[PDB]
Amino acid sequence: VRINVLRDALKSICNAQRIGKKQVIVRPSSKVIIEFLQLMQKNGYISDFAVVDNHRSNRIVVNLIGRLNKAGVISPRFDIPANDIEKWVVNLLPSRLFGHIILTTSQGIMDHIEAQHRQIGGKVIGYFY
Amino acid sequence: NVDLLYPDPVEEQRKHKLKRLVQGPNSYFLEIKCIVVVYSHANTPVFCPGCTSQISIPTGGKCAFTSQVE
Amino acid sequence: MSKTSGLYTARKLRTVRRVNRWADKKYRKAHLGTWLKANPLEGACMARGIVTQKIGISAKQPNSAVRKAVRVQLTKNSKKITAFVPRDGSITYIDNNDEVLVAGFGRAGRAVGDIPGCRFKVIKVAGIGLLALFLRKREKRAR
Amino acid sequence: PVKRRNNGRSKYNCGHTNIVRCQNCHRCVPKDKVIKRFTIRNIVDNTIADDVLNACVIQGFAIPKLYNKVQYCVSCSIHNHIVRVRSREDRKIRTP
Amino acid sequence: GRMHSKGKGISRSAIPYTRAPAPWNKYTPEDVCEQICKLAKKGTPPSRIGLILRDQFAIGQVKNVTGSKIVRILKAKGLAPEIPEDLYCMIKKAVAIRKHLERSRRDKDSKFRLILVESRIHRLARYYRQARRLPPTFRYKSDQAAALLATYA
RNA sequence: GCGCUGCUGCAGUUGAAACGCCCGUAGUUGGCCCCCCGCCGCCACGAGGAAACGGGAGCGCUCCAGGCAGGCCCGUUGGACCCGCCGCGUGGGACCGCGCAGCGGGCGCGGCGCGCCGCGGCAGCCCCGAGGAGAGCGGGCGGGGGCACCGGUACCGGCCGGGGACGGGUGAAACAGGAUGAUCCCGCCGAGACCGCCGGCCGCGCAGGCGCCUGCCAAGACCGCCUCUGUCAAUCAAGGGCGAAGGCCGGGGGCUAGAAGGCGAUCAGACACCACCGUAUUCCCGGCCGUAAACGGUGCCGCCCCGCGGCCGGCGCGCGCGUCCCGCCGGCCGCCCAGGGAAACCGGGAGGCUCCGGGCUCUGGGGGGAGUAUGGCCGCAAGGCUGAAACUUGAAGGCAUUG
Ligand SMILES: [Mg+2]
Ligand SMILES: [Mg+2]
Ligand SMILES: [Mg+2]
Ligand SMILES: [Mg+2]
Ligand SMILES: [Mg+2]
Ligand SMILES: [Mg+2]
Ligand SMILES: [Mg+2]
Ligand SMILES: [Mg+2]
Ligand SMILES: [Mg+2]
Ligand SMILES: [Mg+2]
Ligand SMILES: [Mg+2]
Ligand SMILES: [Zn+2]
């Protein structure tokens, strides 16, 4: 059965971008998907997207512009301490200069840079670069 | 040339009703004159105010009529 | 996936590893206990025994030689082993019914080289190292 | 390794098939793996068909035929040149 | 067809996006309620009731006219069956299988099917015992199923 | 070292390794939705609680391993601070999971309850209906299952008649048959098996497996739908059921073939391959056993994914109305661009993975010894499930290249 909606969305996005497509459709919508996409948009990877209402299982449309090279999720939400972020950054990211790691906190969904700025920790959602 | 947000209405008619951008029925209501509304995919028997018998022939898909009705 | 990955699955993973780490030959040989009870030296660097027979053993098929060895009986176990004195012309220094110290070869408990079924080495006889007797550093005029 | 994608038989959407006997050695073979040919031949060999027709009294008589189906096993087909051992690239050709 | 089989078709129904009644609707929310009343008095299951309403009276969806579903209306009117309909039908099918089997007991596929049906019955009955739709004492027994069928029908 | 114990982070078509299949409890995992209340986890901070060790600020034991010293005109000279917590407090409240039992005012005492009162104050009190599941109606589809019934040649045996010398069998022969009339032709009778050509990159079934006529009984997937319910779900130790052929117990039946056995050839030998005879068995009922190269040598659920084509079932569109062509769902197949791989090859994944995290279950860790010994459980038995060690060994294996 379906479980991780975000994983399916990200796999579809990467698949489409691989063959240089321009638009994608991901079937189930969710708040977490929306925040993930908003962060991606603010960082400049996926431009604009739209949410289509149908009362059940809202669909989404996203517009691509290359740029993105990889995206993923970490299924079991591990609890990163505030001072334990560097190890995950080194393990997961190609370099310590341009990748982004997403965390969910009591202060909301933000990036690892922002969490380091506020010296707080939380749970990990995913990554993109 | 093509945008996924505003599909051509016709290419949408050729797709499955659940895979469409918005799920919707394939069925409709219609009038009959032997002067009442009848379901397109009727399965149970139907009768007129006057007709003493049936005016429906259930099938796999769309119902058939007795042709006397127009 | 193939492996369980849920957030509340530590017990199953621990049990799986506990069961499956017994399939390694080395881990079994170390942590099972049969080898310790079967090893005549009971996990010791070397042992002290009495030589009772001086014998020569042929080599394997691709080689051709007769290696010089002695039969020993360990004081603290009373069991029997075969120990081999490698250095040239060092058999003549070993005499029947003599006190010896016997150690192991490089490999833990496997045969070494073309010598069949031999796992021990002679290093001291009558209290003097064989390596020292071979170099003439000392003499065995006490025996 | 694997030599043929069909595993030497034509078996789809099933578990078991009925068996047949080779007509030469009477070996039991699955129906999907046996080599089948259909033949149509005259009862009288064509050398003497004209002689028979001349001797025939009836008018407009037609020589009857024989309709038979021959089924052979793999070993017997090869030994009797019914099929041939082919090259690696020619094994995929399916036309007669 | 997934729970107890290997198939996976997708034959379903797709209701309209808009919840409003038809422009040619000529029924107040009550008039249907009486029609439901008299139909139920004739021992008609709700699924057949919806079929009859849709075909004969041109009502695509009851909820769009009355704001409520059929079984809720029946419960408010005190006419809903004590035993839910899906479970009752499963028990009917089980009884039929058992009868055909006691006529002749060399058929193994029938036993296979009976096993599947009883498993489904147990699962659904457990769910209904939870959610307080059935008494805690309710239990399904093979040898007394026909009795419950008769009384609870 | 060893990513050869793998949480990070192995492998499971062919090298070692996916239970024969289904149901199923514990266990693990579970779509989307409410802006703030309470509780659990979570993050941060803090209190409290021995040092030594470790980290670490300052100081020239001549350096150093060390030690806490030491300088004169010293922070009050100094020995600062951190580090053994599944508990306690404050805050946050995104994420993860649980909240069935009206409210507000007056009597009514300072507050809270048990109660009595206007309903006269409230919008009084149901997200939606998952290309999740289950139930329902209609339609056809199919070697799917069970029971009774029934036709047809053919093998075998017997009989009436005809005719008169060989016949069978093999690479070639020889054992068995024949003037008591064989082989051959025709007709009748008996019994028991079996279901042909059609018959298939057709189809059905959970798998094992499924093919005469007629009739009966129950069942099932798929499609179509503005029918119903409302998370009822996925996968699974234990447990339960089914399970080719051979085999076993007790009853029936007896025609073909045919383990064992016998006999003729061949060979140096032939107790085997070839020829002939032939018991158990092969068939039915009731019941055990529970194994197969039980193979797609590829576990189940779920998502995305180049292009071309064939076949089966159902539905819809179009016209010049053909069982035409244009589509949708489901199933069975072929070739193949990317990509992957040790390669053979896969590509309806063996892809989307060292750029290495969707969920659940099982198995494997060099080759032998050995699926052996010893225990336990099951079984009438044959045997099945579970399952070592000592000892020995340096390669054993896979895909491919040239001869
Ligand atoms: Mg080969
Ligand atoms: Mg098979
Ligand atoms: Mg299941
Ligand atoms: Mg599906
Ligand atoms: Mg390995
Ligand atoms: Mg092999
Ligand atoms: Mg293997
Ligand atoms: Mg049998
Ligand atoms: Mg297997
Ligand atoms: Mg991996
Ligand atoms: Mg091994
Ligand atoms: Zn043949």
Domain boundaries, chain D: 1-96
Q: What distance in Å separates the CA atoms of residue E66 and residue E74, rounded to the nearest whole number? A: 13
Q: How many CB atoms lie within 10 A of CB E97?
A: 18
| Residue among E14, E24, E51 whose CB faces B17 most closely | E14
Dist. CA E65–CA E20, nearest whole Å: 7
Q: Which contiguous run of DSSP H or E holds residue A115?
A: helix A112-118
Q: Which residues in chain D are followed by a discontinuity, with C-to-N distance exceeding 2.5 angstroms? A: none
Q: Tell me, what DSSP letter sits at residue B14?
A: T
Contacts of E116 (CB under 8 A, 6+ apart): E4
DSSP A69: -
Are A64 and A105 members of one domain?
no
The contacts of residue E7 (CB under 8 Å, 6+ apart) are: E1
C47 CB-near residues (< 8 Å, 6+ apart)? C40, C41, C74, C75, C76, C101, C102
Residue E42 in tokens? 């004739």
- Helices marked H in chain C — which ranges? 10-20, 25-31, 34-38, 130-134
A51, B52, E63 from E12: Cα distances, Å: 25, 34, 19
Pair of tokens at residue D85: 């051992």
Q: Which distant-in-sequence residues (6+ apart) come within 8 Å of C66 by Cβ? A: C56, C57, C58, C59
Q: For chain A, how many structural domains are there in total?
A: 2
Q: Are residue A58 and residue A73 in the same domain, yes or no?
A: no
What are phi and psi for residue C84, nearest 5 degrees? -120, 130
CA atoms within 13 A on the CB side of A1: 3
Chain E residues contacting B via beta carbons under 8 Å: 10, 12-17, 22, 24, 51-52, 54-56, 58, 60
How would you classify the pairing of strands A71-73 and A23-26? unpaired
- Give all chains having 3 or more CB-to-CB distances under 8 Å with chain D: none
Bridge-based pairing of strands C99-104 and C46-58 is antiparallel
Residue B32, domain extent? 1-70
Distance B17 CA to F371 C1' (A): 59
Give me the numbers of helices (H) and strands (E) for chain B, helices first please. 1, 2
Q: Using CA atoms, how far apart are residues A38 and A62, in angstroms rounded to an integer?
A: 11
Q: Is A46 exposed, middle or buried (0-12, 13-18, 19+ CB in 10 A)?
A: buried
User: Can you list the positions of beta strands (E) in C75-134?
Assistant: 80-84, 99-104, 120-125, 128-129
Closest nucleotide over all strands to E103 (CA to C1'): F217
Q: Please tell me what DSSP assigns to residue E153.
A: -
Whether nucleic acid strand F comes within 7 Å of the CB of A107, the answer is yes
CA separation for the pair A102, A89 (Å, rounded): 11
β partners of residue C58: C66
Distance D9 CA to F35 C1' (A): 66
**What's the CA-to-centroid distance between C17 and ligand 5, angstroms?**
16
* Interatomic CA distance for residues D83 and D75, integer angstroms: 10
Nearest to B5 among A54, A56, A61 (CB): A61
* A33 shares its domain with A88: no
User: Which one of E80, E97, E126 terminates a domain?
Assistant: E80
Residues A62 and A86 in one domain: no
Check residues 18 to 57 of chain C and report those whose beta carbon is under 7 Å from nucleic acid strand F.
Answer: 20-21, 23-25, 28-29, 32, 34-35, 38
C7 vs A77, C11, D40, CA distance in Å? 8, 11, 73
Q: Do E95 and E111 fall into the same domain?
A: yes
| Amino acid letter, D73 | C
CB A100 within 8 A of CB A42: no
**Can you give the resolution of this entry in Å?**
2.9
Strands D65-72 and D35-42: antiparallel
- C40-CA/F272-C1' distance, Å: 55
Nearest CA in chain E to B40: E55
Give the ligand at the shortest distance from the Cα of C24: 11
Domain range for A31: 1-68
Which tokens hold the place of A124?
């990990």
Experimentally, how was this structure solved?
Answer: cryo-EM
C2 Cα to the center of ligand 9, angstroms: 18
Number of domains in chain B: 1
Tell me the C-alpha distance between D26 and D31, whole Å: 14
Task: Please give the Cα distance from A68 to E115 (Å, whole number).
Answer: 53
State how far residue A58 is from chain B, nearest Cα, in angstroms: 9
Domain span at E109? 81-151
d(C-alpha D46, C-alpha D42), whole Å: 7
Name where chain C breaks: residue before each gap, C-N > 2.5 Å.
Answer: none
Rg (CA), chain B: 17
E106 lies in the same domain as E137: yes
Phi, psi angle pair for A15, to nearest 5°: -60, -45
Q: Answer whether residue E13 is part of any domain.
A: no
* Domain count for chain E: 2
A67-90 burial, b if ≥16 CB within 10 A, otherwise e?
A: ebeebebbeeeeebeeeebeebbe
What Rg, from alpha-carbon coordinates, does chain E have? 19
Name residue A80's beta-bridge partners.
Answer: A122
Instruction: For residues C14 and E153, give the distance between their C-alpha atoms in angstroms, rounded to a whole number.
Output: 54
The CA distance from C5 to the nearest CA of chain A, in Å, is: 7
Domain contains E141:
yes
Q: Which 73-112 residues of chain C touch chain A by CB within 8 A?
A: none
Say how far apart CA D65 and CA A116 lie, in whole Å. Answer: 94
Measured from the alpha carbon of residue C1, the closest ligand is: 10
Q: Is residue E31 part of a domain?
A: yes
Among A112, A113, A125, smallest CA distance to A9 is for A125
Same domain, E87 and E145: yes
